[PDB]
Amino acid sequence: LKDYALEKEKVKKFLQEFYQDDELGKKQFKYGNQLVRLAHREQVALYVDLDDVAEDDPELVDSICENARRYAKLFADAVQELLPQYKEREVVNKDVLDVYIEHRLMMEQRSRDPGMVRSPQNQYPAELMRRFELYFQGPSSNKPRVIREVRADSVGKLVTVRGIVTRVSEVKPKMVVATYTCDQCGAETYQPIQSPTFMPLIMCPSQECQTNRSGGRLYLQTRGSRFIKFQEMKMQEHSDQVPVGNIPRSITVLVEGENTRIAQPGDHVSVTGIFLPILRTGFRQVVQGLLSETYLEAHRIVKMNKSEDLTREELRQIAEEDFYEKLAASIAPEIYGHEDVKKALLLLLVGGVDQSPMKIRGNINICLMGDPGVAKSQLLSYIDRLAPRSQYTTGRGSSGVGLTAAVLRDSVSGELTLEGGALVLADQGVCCIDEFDKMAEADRTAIHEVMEQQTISIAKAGILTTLNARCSILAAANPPAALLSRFDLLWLIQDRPDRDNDLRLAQHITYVHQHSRQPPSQFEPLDMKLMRRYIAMCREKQPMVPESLADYITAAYVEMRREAWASKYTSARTLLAILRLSTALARLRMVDVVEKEDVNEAIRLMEMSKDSLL
Amino acid sequence: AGTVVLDDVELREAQRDYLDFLDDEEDQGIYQSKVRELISDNQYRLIVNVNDLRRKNEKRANRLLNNAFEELVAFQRALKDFVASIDATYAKQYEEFYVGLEGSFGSKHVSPRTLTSCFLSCVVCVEGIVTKCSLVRPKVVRSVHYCPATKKTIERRYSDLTTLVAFPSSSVYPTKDEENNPLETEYGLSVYKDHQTITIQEMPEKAPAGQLPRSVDVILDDDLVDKAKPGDRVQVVGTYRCLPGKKGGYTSGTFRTVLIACNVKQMSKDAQPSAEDIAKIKKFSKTRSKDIFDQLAKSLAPSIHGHDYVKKAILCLLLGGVERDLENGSHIRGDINILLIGDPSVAKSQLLRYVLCTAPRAIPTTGRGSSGVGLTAAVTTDQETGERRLEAGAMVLADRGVVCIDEFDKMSDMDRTAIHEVMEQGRVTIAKAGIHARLNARCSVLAAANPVYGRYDQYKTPMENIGLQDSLLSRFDLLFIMLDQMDPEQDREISDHVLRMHRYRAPGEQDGDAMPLILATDDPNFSQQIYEKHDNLLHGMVSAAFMKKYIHVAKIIKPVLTQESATYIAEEYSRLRSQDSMSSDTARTSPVTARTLETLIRLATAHAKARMSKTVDLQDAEEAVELVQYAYFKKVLE
Amino acid sequence: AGTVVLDDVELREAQRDYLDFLDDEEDQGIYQSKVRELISDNQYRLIVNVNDLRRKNEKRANRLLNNAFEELVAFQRALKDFVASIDATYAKQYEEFYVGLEGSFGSKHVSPRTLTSCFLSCVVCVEGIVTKCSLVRPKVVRSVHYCPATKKTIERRYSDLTTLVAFPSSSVYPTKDEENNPLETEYGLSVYKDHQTITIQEMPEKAPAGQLPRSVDVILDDDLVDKAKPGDRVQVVGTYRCLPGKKGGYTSGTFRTVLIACNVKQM
Amino acid sequence: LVKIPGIIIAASAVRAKATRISIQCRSCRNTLTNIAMRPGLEGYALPRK
DNA sequence: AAAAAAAAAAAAAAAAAAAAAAAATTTTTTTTTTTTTTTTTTTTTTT
Numbered sequence A: 001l002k003d004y005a006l007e008k009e010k011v012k013k014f015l016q017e018f019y020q021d022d023e024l025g026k027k028q029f030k031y032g033n034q035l036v037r038l039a040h041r042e043q044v045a046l047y048v049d050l051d052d053v054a055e056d057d058p059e060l061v062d063s064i065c066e067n068a069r070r071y072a073k074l075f076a077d078a079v080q081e082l083l084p085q086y087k088e089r090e091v092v093n094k095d096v097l098d099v100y101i102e103h104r105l106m107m108e109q110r111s112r113d114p115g116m117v118r119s120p121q122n123q124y125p126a127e128l129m130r131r132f133e134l135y136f137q138g139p140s141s142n143k144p145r146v147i148r149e150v151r152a153d154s155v156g157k158l159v160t161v162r163g164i165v166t167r168v169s170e171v172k173p174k175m176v177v178a179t180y181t182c183d184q185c186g187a188e189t190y191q192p193i194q195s196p197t198f199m200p201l202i203m204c205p206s207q208e209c210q211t212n213r214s215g216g217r218l219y220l221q222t223r224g225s226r227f228i229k230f231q232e233m234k235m236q237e238h239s240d241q242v243p244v245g246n247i248p249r250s251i252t253v254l255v256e257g258e259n260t261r262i263a264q265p266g267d268h269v270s271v272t273g274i275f276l277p278i279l280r281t282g283f284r285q286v287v288q289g290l291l292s293e294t295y296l297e298a299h300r301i302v303k304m305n306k307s308e309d310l311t312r313e314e315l316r317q318i319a320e321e322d323f324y325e326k327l328a329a330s331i332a333p334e335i336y337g338h339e340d341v342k343k344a345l346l347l348l349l350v351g352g353v354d355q356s357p358m359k360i361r362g363n364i365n366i367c368l369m370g371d372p373g374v375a376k377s378q379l380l381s382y383i384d385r386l387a388p389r390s391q392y393t394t395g396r397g398s399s400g401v402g403l404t405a406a407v408l409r410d411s412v413s414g415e416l417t418l419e420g421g422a423l424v425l426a427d428q429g430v431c432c433i434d435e436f437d438k439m440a441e442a443d444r445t446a447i448h449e450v451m452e453q454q455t456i457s458i459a460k461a462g463i464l465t466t467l468n469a470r471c472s473i474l475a476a477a478n479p480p481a482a483l484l485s486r487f488d489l490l491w492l493i494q495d496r497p498d499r500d501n502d503l504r505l506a507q508h509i510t511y512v513h514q515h516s517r518q519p520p521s522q523f524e525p526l527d528m529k530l531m532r533r534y535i536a537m538c539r540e541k542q543p544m545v546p547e548s549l550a551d552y553i554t555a556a557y558v559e560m561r562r563e564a565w566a567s568k569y570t571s572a573r574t575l576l577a578i579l580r581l582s583t584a585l586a587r588l589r590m591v592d593v594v595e596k597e598d599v600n601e602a603i604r605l606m607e608m609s610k611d612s613l614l
Numbered sequence B: 001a002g003t004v005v006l007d008d009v010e011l012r013e014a015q016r017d018y019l020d021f022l023d024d025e026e027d028q029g030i031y032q033s034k035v036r037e038l039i040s041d042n043q044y045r046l047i048v049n050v051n052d053l054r055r056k057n058e059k060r061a062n063r064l065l066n067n068a069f070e071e072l073v074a075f076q077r078a079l080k081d082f083v084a085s086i087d088a089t090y091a092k093q094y095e096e097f098y099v100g101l102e103g104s105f106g107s108k109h110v111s112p113r114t115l116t117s118c119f120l121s122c123v124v125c126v127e128g129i130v131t132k133c134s135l136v137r138p139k140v141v142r143s144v145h146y147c148p149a150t151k152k153t154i155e156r157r158y159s160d161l162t163t164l165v166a167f168p169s170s171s172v173y174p175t176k177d178e179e180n181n182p183l184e185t186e187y188g189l190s191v192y193k194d195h196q197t198i199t200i201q202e203m204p205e206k207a208p209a210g211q212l213p214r215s216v217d218v219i220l221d222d223d224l225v226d227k228a229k230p231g232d233r234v235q236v237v238g239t240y241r242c243l244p245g246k247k248g249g250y251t252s253g254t255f256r257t258v259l260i261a262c263n264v265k266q267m268s269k270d271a272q273p274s275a276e277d278i279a280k281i282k283k284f285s286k287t288r289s290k291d292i293f294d295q296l297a298k299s300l301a302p303s304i305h306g307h308d309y310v311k312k313a314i315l316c317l318l319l320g321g322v323e324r325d326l327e328n329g330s331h332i333r334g335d336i337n338i339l340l341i342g343d344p345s346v347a348k349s350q351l352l353r354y355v356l357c358t359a360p361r362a363i364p365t366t367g368r369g370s371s372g373v374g375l376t377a378a379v380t381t382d383q384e385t386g387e388r389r390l391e392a393g394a395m396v397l398a399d400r401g402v403v404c405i406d407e408f409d410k411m412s413d414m415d416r417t418a419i420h421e422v423m424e425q426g427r428v429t430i431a432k433a434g435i436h437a438r439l440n441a442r443c444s445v446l447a448a449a450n451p452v453y454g455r456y457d458q459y460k461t462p463m464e465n466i467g468l469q470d471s472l473l474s475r476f477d478l479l480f481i482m483l484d485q486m487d488p489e490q491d492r493e494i495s496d497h498v499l500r501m502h503r504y505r506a507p508g509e510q511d512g513d514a515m516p517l518i519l520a521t522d523d524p525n526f527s528q529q530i531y532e533k534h535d536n537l538l539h540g541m542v543s544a545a546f547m548k549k550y551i552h553v554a555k556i557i558k559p560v561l562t563q564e565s566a567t568y569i570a571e572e573y574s575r576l577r578s579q580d581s582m583s584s585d586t587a588r589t590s591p592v593t594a595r596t597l598e599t600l601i602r603l604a605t606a607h608a609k610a611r612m613s614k615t616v617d618l619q620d621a622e623e624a625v626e627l628v629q630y631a632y633f634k635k636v637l638e
Numbered sequence C: 001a002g003t004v005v006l007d008d009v010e011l012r013e014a015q016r017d018y019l020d021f022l023d024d025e026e027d028q029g030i031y032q033s034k035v036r037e038l039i040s041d042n043q044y045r046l047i048v049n050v051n052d053l054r055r056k057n058e059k060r061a062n063r064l065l066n067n068a069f070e071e072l073v074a075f076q077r078a079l080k081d082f083v084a085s086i087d088a089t090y091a092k093q094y095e096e097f098y099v100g101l102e103g104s105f106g107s108k109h110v111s112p113r114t115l116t117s118c119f120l121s122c123v124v125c126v127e128g129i130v131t132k133c134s135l136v137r138p139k140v141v142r143s144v145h146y147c148p149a150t151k152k153t154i155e156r157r158y159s160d161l162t163t164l165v166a167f168p169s170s171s172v173y174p175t176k177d178e179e180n181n182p183l184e185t186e187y188g189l190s191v192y193k194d195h196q197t198i199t200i201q202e203m204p205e206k207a208p209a210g211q212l213p214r215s216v217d218v219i220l221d222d223d224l225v226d227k228a229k230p231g232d233r234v235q236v237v238g239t240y241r242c243l244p245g246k247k248g249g250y251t252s253g254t255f256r257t258v259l260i261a262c263n264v265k266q267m
Numbered sequence D: 001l002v003k004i005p006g007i008i009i010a011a012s013a014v015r016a017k018a019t020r021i022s023i024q025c026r027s028c029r030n031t032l033t034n035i036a037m038r039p040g041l042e043g044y045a046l047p048r049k
Numbered sequence E: 001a002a003a004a005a006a007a008a009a010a011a012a013a014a015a016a017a018a019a020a021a022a023a024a025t026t027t028t029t030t031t032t033t034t035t036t037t038t039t040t041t042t043t044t045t046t047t
């Protein structure tokens, strides 16, 4: 119970006189500039930082957290009232809604009669004239909650949760303010929408129609009405924060406006937003009372961990001649040895360069075939955690529709939508397929098609589509033409006992068990964040093969093909592999031209991978 | 205003009796201490023992168990008054306090099949298995509204009429002011309580074999919502009532009955564990810190003779190693996997059943009785919302526990391959297009396999006698070949032990009678001395309960490898990999990989935990080395 | 339960202003002395001079005159709070402390003829002669019942819905228990309020000559019932309101009006 | 009254059928306790006034 | 000052204007639950 006029004045003071040094120690009035852009219509969403609010008024932040929707509306009204005094020039009428807004304001000014008192139902709804949205960036003090722990005590509260996106619908038009036009009076009726559904109006309430006592039927218009991009996603508990014997819990997040098209399935997302109910009318409730479903009205969605979205010394380390070896070493440092396999996995992460002269994929596929207990699954899991877009499939737990897509009954409307499996979620990413050799034949055929065509051609009963799965494949198996012909690299890992090697491995593993970290080396291994940043910086560095390298590459190919022919499998795929591996090496070296060193390292990797087969 | 109550003799008597029962200073003080405990823990429900209530006041016990609603109302009023007396500032925080019950209910302890009309309005205790667990929905009990036109704020109060007659005026949610101004509901100020509905089914083992199951619907209000999940065995105590229908000029006699749970408790009363016992454990650890491990090993399975190394390994399993969660999220498992590959009638199955009875969260699985989705996680569709849901399997349930896989060898290769991830990294990664999940199952596997041909042919190598591939065997950190040795002396020992155990009789409880073939007495699974007395007929031995408590306390301790033990283990592992570690005529029972070094580290940590060492020393390392040496080699005769 | 107001800004402001006016200690304690005098005399109706009220706060005076029921309720709450502050036991003894008005009413001072519908829900000071009176009847404001079968004692309260929407639920006198146990009313414990109805006619020497006289019905309650008898030239200060009709289904739109007297004076 | 032989091929769960009901008026809250329900498969039409 | 006539009043009987009281089950819908069918997926057997 507080004076909302006073609260509105407080938020207005904050917005108008808050400042920070975000730009090289220059007081710039952050939210003032944002308001300027909002008035100019160059910005749709405004993200208020509750950390900034608390910098001066912590109790206001507490009030917002205790009752966010109310204070969300208060901030929206404050911005609405502030826009005119920040407006500096005329809007360019970005869209049809802007045209409608200007027309309505113009004719309201025309029929103003300023002194006349207008009925409350005789004005434009506030949401009908916004063209902007206001969301809250949760305070840093608020520790993130857990989907299971967010309960009725948090209803109406600004909670921040973290989880995996298991599903997200496609952006749909959700009506905010329905508009109607009458067949008698030429006046517009408006119906703001708060319930999940609504009943369209029949008769017109316009003063003219009421006076004339005409029929005054009115027709619903999608033109003057106001819509907002609407998405419905489901976030899931992280594995590390589920109870002992419990399966992770899922929360329905509703995203609207500029927050849509930020989170896709499989992303690690931290969602700040308001926990709210939805009345459960209709259902013959078992228990009397106003029981209601729940959801999270999203305000700020951020990508976490691998889903995440430089300094002179950083550029120095990139330029350093040993940068490639540093990156190859930093991958899974707790796993001893396997320097060459680490280099191969780094190349798989970086990728080659896609060419569409007939489109030839630039992905690198690697299959670690090996003896039991040789870190195959450990490296697969490390890549799964590292690669920004990655999926992990162990055996037949995720088989069939777990790899491909399936038709599932949608919820926002109710219909057969298409949900993507592991391969789809790994699209333009990595799929780590452990226990490859034990996989079902159908899944193996699907992986075969994905490794070459980058697609999944499903023609089952309920589904007939061609999914796009542009994912590199890092498979693991234990002891072959059926795999050597296809996979870009086939790497054999045999653990042959040896006194010195086993002693070193035992020392390494014992130190790991002691200090929960890899033994110190000459160079500190790079963090997952830095590694992902460098990998991404390498992705957008497409180099090209000079005409000079043609002779050298052809000579190498013919030589290796002679070796394969003489010995007791080489093909054009071998030369393609050399090309894409060399391009990946060039990407890592930050050059636009593939070089002799690149081709040399490609051939060395191929030679050692094949030597592993013997 | 309406018809308030001026004075009520029965209510006053009930509240006075309950306040007297709760105020315990002239008495022992149990419930005063319990109220202080809940105040300290910031809760608003007290668990009151029906046995204590009956002891102090028979009349109040009968009244509470026969007319629960108003009696529980009076009890909760007394509870709030008592909490205010102890500290009013905390009593003001919570609107109401709740009274759950426990203890023994004579005829009110029933199964969903036996919960009939006779128990309507009474307090009942029902033990069963959860089948359905709806979502936790907020139910509004006090709604705050704001009128922008008049700046007024209003509060609407809705009574919990779940089982009482409700009229529409009670449930009318306000939307317009008196003069039809729009009202905006303030969610941040309104009050909601979590509400859930579950279903409790007659336990499959206790239900009659012939007929179909019987179930009961249970309403859980705040503080009792996420206490149970489908498939769990739980005890729910609450009032069995009738749910009102809906307004209608016609009605059939039928009524929909439910159970408003006042408390819910896990069947896994064994999943959880005094200063006397704590000091006893401290002295036991301190006194004989070297032979404590051996004494525990020998006392582990008293009814099974011999198998010293097998029992040592089982103790190491029950203790578990120390997991290593690295700075990069990498995971090194701490659980320990044992495969008893053995000749018929060598007590491997009995060891499995011992671990079932002893260890917390032990799940019994069989070769072909738990296939695929039943053994690991699964994905299904709700069939009502058309949405995909996870379903925990045997190992997901056994997370932070043990899975006893009898007849492991006769599992399909599909299932055995599916179990690889659980064995290695302790999780199940399952995905269908709709939903992908990474469930945690950090379980330890105790498998009981018989060799190909039925009986272990000692002339053939262990690789041949074990019909399993090296990739699978590497999963099991310890592999014990348990032969039915034909030594007459050991035969004498075993026969004497068996006959002594068969001759044993219960002390006093039995005198020549027959063991009987449950609702009459409280259910043991839910029921609330260092050494055994040296009976000559059982010994010719640490107590079971003290062993349980000591293992529980020693599980938490996290010993850290010391440099000396690390060097010793590394040298021994190098030798084990080397060829010289095995002489002629000895064959490896399982290939030695880095998995075996992890086995050594885990076994040494388990030994250090048995000793509560806080450091894994050369003693522990040597014991682990010796056990691995015994387990990983076999001498093949010609 | 039901709707309960939390932040009624107008009610809070009215209570604050009325309590400030009744403080009076710095303002030569006129109303402080009046409250003390009524406390000593064992009275529970304070007569307030509207001229002094207007001098202190013209806003409150206008609000009270033009909105009778709301402002009178706020004034009575403030008076009860003041009476409790001066002496708590007396405040607890008397449930509700009433406020009657006195002084110079610029336009509200009228006669039964000039009293038109423009004064509904306002404070009017009407002069006239009592043409007739009614017997003083007790209306039950709080009934108490005892159930011999269960020894329970219940107490029902009836609100003063004289000029407010009233439903059958509010005006049902319990005669059985929830289990159909006959009740017995405890008349001694029950609370009754005396109520009377009089008729004020325009003074013949003031009425226009040769015309029939104009009358008005006045409702008197506890502590005002027997303040006048037929033939008394009385000044009644009260609230003019429309009396609700019986539950119908068809309404002719005609509403009997009446004056809920808050003060009665003789010559 | 009939005596017949047969075999039971199903048996529904045991539910609660009211033998007496107490109906309370919404307006005056007065009750009409102890209304004798008929036995068997049969319903009761509540009073309208 | 007394008798008769006039009228003046009091009380009782009667007839409308407005208000108040009395009387009131049946048909159709939808939701849940349960079952049946199709296709895909998985499992098992034979070569």
Ligand SMILES: Nc1ncnc2c1ncn2[C@@H]1O[C@H](COP(=O)(O)OP(=O)(O)O)[C@@H](O)[C@H]1O
Residues within 6 Å of the ligand: A334, A335, A336, A337, A370, A371, A372, A373, A374, A375, A376, A377, A378, A379, A505, A508, A509, B332, B333, B424, B594, B595, B598
């Ligand atoms: N070269 C190595 N360096 C460090 N640890 C290793 C090495 N090889 C195996 N390990 C350890 O041994 C275990 C077995 O490896 P894992 O990859 O699970 O077997 P697989 O290769 O069959 O998947 C892992 O826990 C891993 O940490």
Ligand SMILES: Nc1ncnc2c1ncn2[C@@H]1O[C@H](COP(=O)(O)OP(=O)(O)O)[C@@H](O)[C@H]1O
Residues within 6 Å of the ligand: B303, B304, B305, B306, B343, B344, B345, B346, B347, B348, B349, B350, B351, B494, B497, B498
């Ligand atoms: N060493 C032993 N000590 C005690 N009992 C034994 C021993 N060996 C066999 N038995 C007895 O033989 C029976 C074998 O049954 P079980 O253990 O279920 O089969 P298996 O021994 O093949 O696992 C048990 O009832 C057990 O009492």
Ligand SMILES: [Mg+2]
Residues within 6 Å of the ligand: A376, A377, A434, A435
């Ligand atoms: Mg593996």
Ligand SMILES: [Mg+2]
Residues within 6 Å of the ligand: B349
């Ligand atoms: Mg057996």
Ligand SMILES: [Zn+2]
Residues within 6 Å of the ligand: A182, A183, A184, A185, A186, A187, A204, A205, A206, A209, A216, A217
């Ligand atoms: Zn119109």
Ligand SMILES: [Zn+2]
Residues within 6 Å of the ligand: D025, D026, D027, D028, D029, D030
């Ligand atoms: Zn009634």
